[PDB]
Amino acid sequence: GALDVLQMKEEDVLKFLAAGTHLGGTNLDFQMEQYIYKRKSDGIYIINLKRTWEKLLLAARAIVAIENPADVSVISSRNTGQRAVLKFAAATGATPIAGRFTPGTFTNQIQAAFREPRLLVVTDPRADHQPLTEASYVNLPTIALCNTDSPLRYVDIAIPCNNKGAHSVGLMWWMLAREVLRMRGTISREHPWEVMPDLYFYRDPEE
Template sequence: IERLNIAAKFISYYPPEKVVVVSTHIYGTKPVQKFCELTGCIPITERFEPGSFTNPILETYIEPELVLVSDPRYDRQAVIEARIAQIPVIAMCSTDNTITDVDLVIPMNNRGRLALPYAFWYLARRVLIERGVLTPELAENIKPDDFLAIQQEPKP
């Protein structure tokens, strides 16, 4: 939780349109999309096209000031390009991840079906709190279930 709070503070220092959140992991797609919807960050949930941070000729070229990845193993190309472009990287890392080129590590299970959704739910709330835009009404509407890749059926 402490590292998620630090990451939220770090993310809140940057304009939302300059923060790119990358997840090509199957369980990270929906959480990243919802996180970016709430915070205004830029999601990349499909294949990360090489050169997106380093080749201005590409249509997909963007110049972020901060990159957040859900798994440095799956999102390695984004981490490498961020290093080349000298962009800080925040990464959610499990025990088997390499933390080379990562500036802030959030130690957590990033493989489980529920781990990433709950981490992104908490991080979204903390970022909105740090920016001072989380109203009680908005807080009620941000539910962890909205971040789940597969919505669970309500129990009768």
């Protein structure tokens, strides 16, 4: 949005630059091309950082529009997102799934794990492909974190970022939790937040 109260600050841009979020792959799909700045002299694509913040605020404006927070479902089958989705679901009251998704969880009405959500958020479209393709049987809207070579086939909001691993995946979930809590009125739009980004990251060498 145009508003100064929604503008991206210097201190967020430095946190993007320090985590590698702007660095894509060596390949580009034709659906992702509008999110790209340029290709480097070494064959790597640069993701446009202002495009990310608009698509992330549009995603937060979808997540705030659900009146019961337990109706939102959150997923990661790769390890680099598992701590991050568990912390996101603690900060705001969504339902997490981590590890293997069981086929038929959304469509086998009798099943012990059966559930019926209103919104679905996924960490990587190529890896999390079962809950994406299974959402096509039940009228379920979708948000996803997309790299330059991600296949867009059932996602309705794609957020441009490096999703390969490490600090970049944890930072995106932390920043999405910050803005949903801000615009619902639970924390300040000006005072810094008490939760450090480093709480969401995956398994750097411990000692």
